[PDB]
Amino acid sequence: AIIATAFAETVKFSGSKQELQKRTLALYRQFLRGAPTFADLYEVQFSIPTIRTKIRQEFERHRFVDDLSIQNVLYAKGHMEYQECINFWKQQAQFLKYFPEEDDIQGRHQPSNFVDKFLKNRA
């Protein structure tokens, strides 16, 4: 395989943290710009701002990561996920892995205190 696929980039490992910060910056710009495509493409029920606030809160999850090479693998995994999402490779049931809390409320009795955990012995 000589030529690559469409949105791919050669996986290459930066030696500094600021260059990685620039790359994750451009990456969030790519997700956020392609967010109107995903609602048309995967036929979701909901609004484009919920896609955008999810992309934001999935980069909130790894804001305080110190180690450089763990940021490096995290960037490579994020670019692979962008690559799958911007094409039609993922389907609409694996795109909705990302939104389990939105689609339906499962029922009563979400346990909060120790008693509600304990009546069904920590579920």
């Binding site: 910060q21 620039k22 910056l25 451009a26 969030y28 710009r29 956020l32 710009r33 955008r52 934001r56 980069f59």
Partner: protein
Amino acid sequence: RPDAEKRIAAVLESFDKISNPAAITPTASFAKDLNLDSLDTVEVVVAIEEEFGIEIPDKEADEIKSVNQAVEYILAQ
């Protein structure tokens, strides 16, 4: 180009983490004057370019830090 900063203020007003919608001056810094993050900066710039239909490269997206630079950039079309 009149009525542009009113449109940019209308876009920038619809967000959160801004406890003063009246603090949008035409020389407002995103990080300093409005208390925005890095992700907030590249959220507001994408929401700015979404309003028009234009598209921006990386070297012209990474440099925008204030709304003065957005109103300086606006006349590319």
